[PDB]
A and B are shown apart, each in its own frame.
With several copies, the nearest count.
Chain A
């Protein structure tokens, strides 16, 4: 029950509710659940997966940031 606001400097990519997400963090991949604690994250070039209701969509990112509320 957390809305994933994947936004890029040019355009918004995704603003839908997602029940499961991974994150290519610089100190190990982190899977965030809709109850996760607040977090700040730096992403190296990797591969984020969106698993909303068992979606399992690969999504290649080349670095960035992540704020988990």
Chain B
């Protein structure tokens, strides 16, 4: 009734961290396997993987900033 904003912030952060964590996990696993298989193609690989970790993290941050709008404001 009165503690719903705390629950909203907690749920927002937890659900924004539960998904992108697995996303960056599989990104890193795939990038590592590609690096081990072909070290000569590393450069593009690195850029692409960072682009990947640019995307999902931002989504998580979006959830976080949404919680930042929920806890305060």
Contacts and interface: CB of A to CB of B under 8 A. Distances in A.
- Decide if A and B touch, CB cutoff 8 A: yes
Interface of A: 22, 27-39, 49
A39 B38 CA distance: 10
B36 interface: yes
16 contacts: A28-B38, A29-B36, A29-B40, A29-B41, A30-B37, A30-B38, A31-B40, A33-B41, A35-B38, A36-B37, A36-B38, A36-B39, A37-B36, A37-B38, A37-B41, A39-B37
Interface in B16-41: 33, 36-41
Contacts of B33: 28
A64 B38 CA distance: 19
A37 B33 CA distance: 11
A5 B41 CA distance: 23
B69 to A, nearest CB: 45
